Amino acid sequence: SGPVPSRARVYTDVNTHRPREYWDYESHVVEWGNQDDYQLVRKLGRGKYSEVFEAINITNNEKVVVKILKPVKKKKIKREIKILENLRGGPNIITLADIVKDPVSRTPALVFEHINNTDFKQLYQTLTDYDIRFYMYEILKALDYCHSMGIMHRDVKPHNVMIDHEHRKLRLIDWGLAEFYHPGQEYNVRVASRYFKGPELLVDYQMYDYSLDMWSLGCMLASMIFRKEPFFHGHDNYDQLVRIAKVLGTEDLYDYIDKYNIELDPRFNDILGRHSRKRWERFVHSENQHLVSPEALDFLDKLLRYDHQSRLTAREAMEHPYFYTVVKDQARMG
Numbered sequence: 001s002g003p004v005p006s007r008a009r010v011y012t013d014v015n016t017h018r019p020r021e022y023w024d025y026e027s028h029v030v031e032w033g034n035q036d037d038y039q040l041v042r043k044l045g046r047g048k049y050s051e052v053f054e055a056i057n058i059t060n061n062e063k064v065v066v067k068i069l070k071p072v073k074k075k076k077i078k079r080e081i082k083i084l085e086n087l088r089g090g091p092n093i094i095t096l097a098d099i100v101k102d103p104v105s106r107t108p109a110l111v112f113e114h115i116n117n118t119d120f121k122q123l124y125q126t127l128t129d130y131d132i133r134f135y136m137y138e139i140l141k142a143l144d145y146c147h148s149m150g151i152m153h154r155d156v157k158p159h160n161v162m163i164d165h166e167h168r169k170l171r172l173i174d175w176g177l178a179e180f181y182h183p184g185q186e187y188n189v190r191v192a193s194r195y196f197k198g199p200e201l202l203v204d205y206q207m208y209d210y211s212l213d214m215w216s217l218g219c220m221l222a223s224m225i226f227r228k229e230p231f232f233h234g235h236d237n238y239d240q241l242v243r244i245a246k247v248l249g250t251e252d253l254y255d256y257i258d259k260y261n262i263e264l265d266p267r268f269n270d271i272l273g274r275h276s277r278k279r280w281e282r283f284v285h286s287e288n289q290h291l292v293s294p295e296a297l298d299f300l301d302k303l304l305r306y307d308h309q310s311r312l313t314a315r316e317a318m319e320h321p322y323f324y325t326v327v328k329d330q331a332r333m334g
């Protein structure tokens with residue numbers, strides 16, 4: 001008949017129950033700020049869809065970051081803008097400060113709050129067990145918030161998580177692949193970085209939901225506590241699922257495929273083969289054991305599940321004993 005349909009377990013109808021103007025980004029009309037407020041200072045990065053610069057707001061001398069977009073259809077730009085505006089003020093969500101027309105490229109440029117982020121090299125060789133729990137908890141706040149607002153990020157990965165370590169400050173950035181969740185909708189599976197793609201994308205199951213972000217987050221946790229980035233390192237999208245199967249096993253993978261009546265290319269089955277489920281303890285060695293605990297492995301195991309419907313939600317994840325010390329610490333009298 002086709003694959004078995006699927007709905008999100010939580011926040012299923014959040015957009016169903018909001019005004020059309022909340023999620024109908026195509027009709028959103030941008031009001032433009034003034035580009036002459038901002039002077040570019042140095043290029044930070046070059047992407048396929050944008051250039052990113054450190055800049056100065058010359059009217060108050062504050063640093064900002066400017067993302068100058070490549071020419072793209074109005075609809076994709078409006079989607080990102082709408083989502084950033086809907087989510088503005090949410091916990092650990094990057095703040096969109098302004099939208100201007102770049103005077104040279106004549107393309108939209110998005111202006112963000114500046115985060116003095118610690119570079120990866122120093123960070124992931126200095127992070128303690130407590131640091132990892134704390135920052136994971138902060139990422140979960142952002143994901144619960146955006147999921148509760150009817151939005152999937154769909155590009156959760158280390159480089160889209162900015163951390164200012166001395167201020168213990170974290171922002172989830174890069175909302176350019178984000179989309180509104182509508183139950184029953186078939187989404188594009190060409191989202192997320194290869195290494196953080198969930199099984200549902202790798203087998204071309206389009207009716208996915210917020211739980212995609214929880215797989216990606218589980219991949220991030222594994223890479224941090226086992227000190228191997230990325231944890232699942234495939235050479236293409238097919239090989240990515242093979243790397244996952246060599247750890248999670250093929251039994252539970254085929255059970256997943258059976259439950260949703262998903263059809264795989266016969267050659268996919270070949271490369272997938274037959275693999276036993278490994279114990280998480282197999283990846284613990286002397287150089288990472290200080291980051292690993294029974295609580296971390298239990299938590300990890302409940303994120304990295306083939307069946308998207310069986311993964312923890314962000315709110316459930318925050319209730320895990322892994323975070324008891326973090327929660328206690330954040331319970332302040334102020």
Ligand SMILES: O=C1C=C2C[C@@]3(O)COc4c(ccc(O)c4O)C3=C2C=C1O
Pocket residue numbers: 044045052065067094112113114115116117162173174175176
């Ligand atoms: O869509 C994006 C993309 C970026 C690219 C980029 O990662 C560059 O570097 C940044 C930054 C944001 C704050 C910041 O302090 C910083 O250094 C960025 C973004 C924010 C977004 O919403």
